[PDB]
Design a protein around this ligand. Sequence first.
Ligand SMILES: NC(=O)CC[C@H](N)C(=O)O
Ligand code: NA
Ligand code: NA
Length: 223
Amino acid sequence: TVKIASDSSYAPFEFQNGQKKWVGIDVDIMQEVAKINDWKLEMSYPGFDAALQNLKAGQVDGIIAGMTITDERKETFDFSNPYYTSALTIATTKDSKLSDYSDLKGKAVGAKNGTAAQTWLQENQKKYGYTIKTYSDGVHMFAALSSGNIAGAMDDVPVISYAMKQGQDLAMNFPSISLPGGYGFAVMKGKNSTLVDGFNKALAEMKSNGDYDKILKKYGITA
Ligand SMILES: NC(=O)CC[C@H](N)C(=O)O
Ligand code: NA
Ligand code: NA
């Protein structure tokens, strides 16, 4: 088998539909990577930093979870070629009057544990003077956002946008931070090299034959 761990709630990359079924961009791509490569694919959805721990323990073989490729992360993981862009911004409720990172001084800002959002928040904390609240789970972070206990939640643009499209009480009034790495498939550094190659080879074939484009189209994304 090939065991891949993912997030539990990260629409449109992985999420459950109305019949409790796991769907999303990451799900469609990984299933297709497995078919093209003839892998028995065993997906699990424990959560992002849960998936990180399962990967480092060897309980799974790699991760697909909207995971941003970063230079720092490249010291623990090997990544595929990117298959999506990676950008961060502040979600707020619709009725929020905050719009700039300078507004967050002396306020509590959420981030999911182990993520590029938490890293950026940590790197820019002295600059803007917010306090960082951490949650492993996106459900907990956005519950805090809705409850008013955090002034904003940093997360990835496509995920906030998608849920805004679902009519959730969310707005994107802040500038976005573009991260250069994009999203990749990740394995432990020096391990499972051929999973990365298989991912790369299938992804190129999916771009050239147009299956990649069709996956993004399913979820409302113009590529
Ligand atoms: N599933 C996630 O929350 C991933 C968030 C972000 N792209 C990261 O890589 O940390
Ligand atoms: Na980087
Ligand atoms: Na970063």
